[PDB]
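Input/output pair, single chain:
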Amino acid sequence: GSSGSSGKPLPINPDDLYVSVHGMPFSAMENDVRDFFHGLRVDAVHLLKDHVGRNNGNGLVKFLSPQDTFEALKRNRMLMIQRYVEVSPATERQWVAAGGHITSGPSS
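Output:
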């Protein structure tokens, strides 16, 4: 194998802070989520539902700092309430479409 390392100095990208979790019980709720990421800086937690307003098994998490989320990525494909969760980075676009909300810069 072989590969080069060509990167640039850029500021923390939201994509990181914004991750998605697929594979949660039908009863899983804002609370249950905590149990998983209980101990890290939690800012907000988005949960997707279906027509029957039921937690199928997909949501998004937004952490203030990245150093925190980085940990969640390590808890990907873990055991949760007899259900496998899929922790993977997300894109601002998804966060919006899904039904999120953030304050750009509340100015007078």
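Residues 13-94 form a domain with the Alpha-Beta Plaits fold (CATH 3.30.70.330). Residues 74 and 88 are 9 Å apart (CA to CA).
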